[PDB]
Structure formats: C-alpha cells, structure tokens
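Reviewer comment 2.1 asked that we show a complete input and output for one of the modelled complexes. We chose the ANP case, as it is the one discussed in the main text.
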Amino acid sequence: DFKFP
Amino acid sequence: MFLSEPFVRTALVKGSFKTIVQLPKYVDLGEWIALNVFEFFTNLNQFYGVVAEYVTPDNAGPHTDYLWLDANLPASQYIDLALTWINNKVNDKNLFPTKNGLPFPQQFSRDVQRIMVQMFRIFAHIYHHHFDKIVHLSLEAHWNSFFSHFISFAKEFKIIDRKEMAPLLPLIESFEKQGKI
Amino acid sequence: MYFERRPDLLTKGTQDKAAAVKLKIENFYQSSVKYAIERNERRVELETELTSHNWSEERKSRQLSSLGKKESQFLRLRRTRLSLEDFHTVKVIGKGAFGEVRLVQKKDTGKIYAMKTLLKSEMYKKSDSPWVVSLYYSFQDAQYLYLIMEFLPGGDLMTMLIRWQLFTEDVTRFYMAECILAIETIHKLGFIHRAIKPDNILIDIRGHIKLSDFGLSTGFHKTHDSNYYSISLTMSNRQQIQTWRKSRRLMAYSTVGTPDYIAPEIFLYQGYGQECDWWSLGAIMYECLIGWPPFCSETPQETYRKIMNFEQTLQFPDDIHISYEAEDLIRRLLTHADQRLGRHGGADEIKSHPFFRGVDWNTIRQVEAPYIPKLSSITDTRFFPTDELENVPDSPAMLPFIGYTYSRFDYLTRKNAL
Ligand SMILES: Nc1ncnc2c1ncn2[C@@H]1O[C@H](COP(=O)(O)OP(=O)(O)NP(=O)(O)O)[C@@H](O)[C@H]1O
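Response of the prediction step:
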C-alpha cells in the first residue's frame, strides 16, 4: 500500500 | 505614633508615580482599577500577615475608631473580618469578572470605594497601633513607598473623599514630596 | 526621634516573613515599572505607524482603540485565577509514575486540551515549532502541578507499533524522517532530548508525527548497575511478544523509564552530547522493522548488559524484510558515540544516507501519512489504551493560585491561538 520514496 | 522622624527619606521612590499610576492611554478604567485593587489588597494582606501573629484584643486609632460593632470589634477581629471581606469582593466574578468580555457592573465603581476604604481602615489600623516595630527589620523604604502608592491611586481616581483622611491627614502632607498633587 | 532597633523575640514566622516581603516589594515595583514602560512603548509604536501611512481619523481611532482593546484584556488576564472545576475531565489517556495525562475540556469555554498531572516534592531537581507539542500555560496547587497542551488524537508510536506489530521499510522511512526533523530542530535550539522512545512520540490529526517534550522534567536516572550473581518452554519470537506484553500490561503505568533506546555513554559518567539522541532513533528504527528493540531482555539490567557489550549483542533475526540500506543505517546509528552517524556536524549527515533518497525534506510535512487516524469526534480517545490501572503511591488524602502575571508578548502568542 503506502509508498514513500 | 510619632511617625515623622528623620526617616522620611523613603527609598524606592526614585520617580513620581505619574508613570505607573496615571491611567494608560486607551485603557478601560475598570481594568485599570480592578487590577490595582486586586494588586493593592494582595500586598496589603502580606503586611498584616507578617503581623497577624501578635494582634490581640487591644480596635482602631484615636479621636475616631472603626467600630465593626455597628450593625447586625477588637484589633485582630475586624481586621481578619474586613480583610477577608475584600478577598471575596475581589474574587467575585460579578464585580471582578475574570471572563473575557463581561462588562463591569453598575455596582462596580461603588464597591470600588467600599473595598478601597476598608483597606484604608486596615491601612490606618497598621499606621497607629502596630506601626512601631516596623523600623526593626529595615522595611521603612518599603512601607513608605507602598503607602505613597495606595493614596496616589486613590487620589488620581478619587475613590476616597478628603474627610476620611483625618486619621492620616498630617502624614499625607509629610509625603507630599512623592505625592502627585 | 534619632533611635535604633534590634532582633530578639520575633518568632521566626514573623522574622523570615519580612525577608519574604522585601523580596516581594522589590520584584513588584521593579516590574510595575517595566510593565508601564512597555505599555507606553508599544502604544507609541502603533502611533508612529498610524501617522506613517496617511490614514483617516476614523481609521486611526479604530486601530488605536484596537490597541487598547488588547491592552485591557491583558490586565484582565493577570487578574484571572483558575484551577480545576474550571476544567472538566473527559477521559484518562496515559500514566507515568509521577502522574497521569488527561484529555480535558475547559468548562469556562470548552476546547480540547491535554492535561499533564505531576507531583511536586517527588520530582526533586532540588519556541512554537511544528514538530513539538504546544505548551500554553501552567498552574499549581497544594500538591500537584498542571500543564496545558494541545491534544494529539493520533495516540503514540508505542500504541501504533502494537496495532501493526511491524512497519514496512516505507512506513518506517516516513516516520523516521519525521523524527530526524523533529530531533534536528530540538538540537538547533541548543537542547538534547535524551528521552527519545516510542511512547514519547505523538501523532496529529493528519497522521503526522511530533515530539512531546524536550527532556527537562520527564523522569529519573539509571542505577548505574546492580548484581544478582530446567525444561525450556519457548519458541523465541513468541518469547519477546511474551516479555514485551509484560512491559506494558504491568509497566506502562507506574513505569521505570526502560533503558532501551538509552545510548551507552549515559550509563557511564556525564560525558555525552547531541549525538546522544540519534542512537535512540536507530534503536527505534530497528524496533519497528524487526519487532522489538535491539536489546530487549527479560529484565532491564540484562538490557543494561547488552547495551554495554553492544558490539556482540546486536543481531538481526532471520526474518528478512531488511534491505542492505536499512540494515546499514541502524548499524551506523547504533555504534560508538564519537563514531556514530550524525555526530560529526551531523543531524543532516543522516539525511544523506542511501536509505532515503527521501522527499525534498520540504514537502515531507504535506504528504499522505501511512495511517491517518480515523476520528469520530473532537474527543476521540480511540487511539489510547484507555484501560485503567491507577496506583500512584502519593495519596495525601483529604480559583486558588493566580495562573499568570506574565508579559505582554506571551499574551499575544497565547491569544493568537488559545
Ligand atoms: N499531548 C499529548 N496528547 C495526547 N496524549 C498524550 C500527550 N502527552 C502524553 N500523552 C499520553 O501519555 C503518554 C506519554 O506520557 P508521559 O508524559 O511521557 O509519561 P512519563 O512517565 O512522564 N514519561 P514517559 O512515561 O517515559 O513517556 C503517551 O504515550 C500518550 O498515551
């Protein structure tokens, strides 16, 4: 789900 | 007593009270007063509180006495009475509303004089009966200035009348070198 | 009457009650002057600006009345005294050892504040940044001490870590980067927090993170050490989910201040520095990636032992989930102080680790956070372990206290929110 690059 | 000795040098008076007692510009007179009345009482009550220990039957000063026996008292009696009276008129959120935008009552300026005078009743009760031992612990510069303050405010805004000062009318004029005529 | 005077028979309740008055009167008139002197100062500050713009006389005597409008409210404030019964309690939120924490509505108006209850005589000791909880004002009484803070409904990171039991490398990267930026800021104001830990970390309405404190008056210190000097029954990841569960069900309330997240050079003498708090970050980072903190043990002394021999006690389990940049970072944060990441002119020496390639570190505050608290009101304690233990061996059993004679400046700032 969540994605923070 | 003989309260006009060479001590009338009253330290901590290095100005003339027209800078902390004049109503500041654009300030609700109620706030400007209801603060000082709070202030004045709160400090006066530390004064009799350093003396309450020794107050025992023998009322008030000479030629004129503050009878608490007036409608249905000794020294310690009508002080812890009038003193406690003030505390309550001042913590009353009706006359002294701490809430933000409450307007001051119609009673307000009236109770102002009332609270003011009973303070002087306990102000003066200190200056004739128990004023002697003051000079013991180097607190004359203090009480001198502080008295030099209580009147100044009461005169600037005239919440006490001239005749009620006969108990100290000679001492008022002694301090009219920092007295804001 | 050229006389004199002396001590001897003023019975020490009216001796030192004069040392008090002299103190009272000096500080008084010193300040009565300051007050008036700035009262004047800012008045003439606005009046030099009302005739610096060619404005109408309707306009100036509205601005000028707006000024004294303020000024009056100030003296109305100092006159204010409040206590409880000027607050209504909503629910209990947390407990430390010294006292609990309370979601509170102010009967007087009705807001959502956070009430932190403390204990004088038991804590011996004898501004305005996005990243830290806002303290407004405080007031005392006989026995306890009361602080008024905004209420963060997101719960705490400890309570998060329970509900999810494990973060991903992306969830964690977010929440870590948030901590860096909080911690960075605290350090920039010349402080070391020395109390970084999960439950000490808080979540706002938009799922974002902020610190709660600064490490002045939280707690205690560590005993520096102590000494004590069969069929197994365990499966060993379970073994912690067993011990940990005993470190909250009987240790959250009436806590000790667990030594996890305590860097090593603290148990030594006073020899530490800003670097102190980055360890705890790495401690924490480890915890949410693996499932427990690095030195989690049956008992806290054991935990002391591990941190002190940390070079052989740090091991990552065989639950894989950890890149070659994750594992590196924790390692370079969980090392010797003078060698640790973020020591050498650091605090953004951390941001340049290849575990981020992060957001511009600017937009970080504007970003969808892994969990936005799904809130049902303005008094939603849902994110708190609202179960109750309530054992504080203080029990002293059975509108006082003017809360403020402040300064004008704090009047504005606190008015500009309250
Ligand atoms: N501003 C706040 N808003 C909401 N909950 C809070 C707030 N401050 C504290 N809490 C709650 O109380 C906990 C923190 O309590 P805290 O005041 O840190 O206890 P402490 O013993 O003094 N120090 P510690 O217990 O080691 O964290 C959090 O995990 C929350 O559950």
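Residues C 93-94, 96-98, 101, 114, 116, 133, 149, 151-152, 156, 158, 199-200, 202, 212, 218-219, 255, 257, 384 surround ANP (CB under 6 Å). We note this here for comparison with the apo prediction described in Section 3.2.
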